Amino acid sequence: RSRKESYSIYVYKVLKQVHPDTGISSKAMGIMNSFVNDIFERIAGEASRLAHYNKRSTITSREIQTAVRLLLPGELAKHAVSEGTKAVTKYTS
Amino acid sequence: TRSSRAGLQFPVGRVHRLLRKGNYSERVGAGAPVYLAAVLEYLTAEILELAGNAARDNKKTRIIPRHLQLAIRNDEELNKLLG
């Protein structure tokens, strides 16, 4: 089967910003890595899949944004959509 | 790096390659992987924030699987996104 990527080092960096004194067990980190791999593959899936069904040559932030609101429930989407636009607003500027 | 310039811990370059894997003929704008990296960093921060609170509430200094469960199973939106 398919190989998952390892996001542990980046999950750990995020943990230190939200809980600097708190560690994480190996098994708990493995669960986080599977969550991150699962959401990456789901959002990236519909963005590639919206660009090919809407006759678009390029995957942009607006396929990610649409996919995020297709898959994420309620306030998670709005906040994720908030955080996504602010990131490209530092990036483009 | 492109990830610092977006204010992110998650690697933008890796998300770019992940997006290109879905269709090697589909091109990837610069905004797409930055936006997606920030979305996953937010979701990661949200789970760890709540799981870290569960660890602290139980007088623990590290997150264990039970803390992830307590955090997600008691959050309707996370439990229904992650299962």
């Binding site: 080092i9 750990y12 560690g23 067990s25 190996s26 098994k27 708990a28 | 264990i64 699987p65 039970r66």
Partner: peptide
């Protein structure tokens, strides 16, 4: 028997960056 097929915390080592 929790030690036979349950979660044992003392066997779940800390995740280590370095």
């Amino acid at each position: 028997d929790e030690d036979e097929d349950g979660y044992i915390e003392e066997e779940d080592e800390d995740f280590q960056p370095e």
